[PDB]
């Protein structure tokens, strides 16, 4: 994930 972001998890799906 870009320097403006972090990996999160929503509903079991990882997303930046």
């Amino acid at each position: 994930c870009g320097a403006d972001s972090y990996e999160m998890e929503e509903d079991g799906v990882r997303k930046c």
Partner: antibody
Amino acid sequence: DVQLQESGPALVKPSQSLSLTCTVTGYSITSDYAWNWIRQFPGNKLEWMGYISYSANTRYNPSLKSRISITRDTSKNQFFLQLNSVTVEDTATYYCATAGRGFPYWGQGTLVTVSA
Amino acid sequence: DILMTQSPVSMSLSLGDTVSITCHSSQDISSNIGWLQQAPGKSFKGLIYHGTNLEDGVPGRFSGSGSGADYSLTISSLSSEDFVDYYCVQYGQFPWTFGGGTSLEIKR
């Protein structure tokens, strides 16, 4: 290895219901990830239909909202697609897939024709 | 919905060639893109997620680049098994959407 397999009818009449099963082995559908239906049209265009999450939350493509339901059976480790009021426009190859970090696991795909 | 425009639609290349497949999104997707591989007539394999991360057991010749709305899958030094179909997928906004695909064919 995690394995997914679609099953269901090859033919559904217009205005009837399309119902598919995805049988999951090697990983529990209650442990993690979202459990998706995707279809590929004649011509190869892909559409995301929706998912049921490991925690039972559903999310659906708005284009299909009035007609779609995704459900599961945790005892059998299976999840299901129901698509109502189908038309010839619903003829496609249907896939189940896992979304977690990208889309690592996919069923083999199953052709469903909608025709009278 | 987010439109994913994938290029080129098809390419003819030789063994050992390097190719980039690109996807442009109609809105910023913040690297929430995957690349999928498909043998024609068969099903899919996840190659890359979050724009750049290789899935387990994908060779170092596959790379991903891009940010914002423009991303590329690059295959450096094409091998025989690589001449198949490829698709991008965005999961940055619902509903999730796909690129139209790229078919790679080998010269002979």
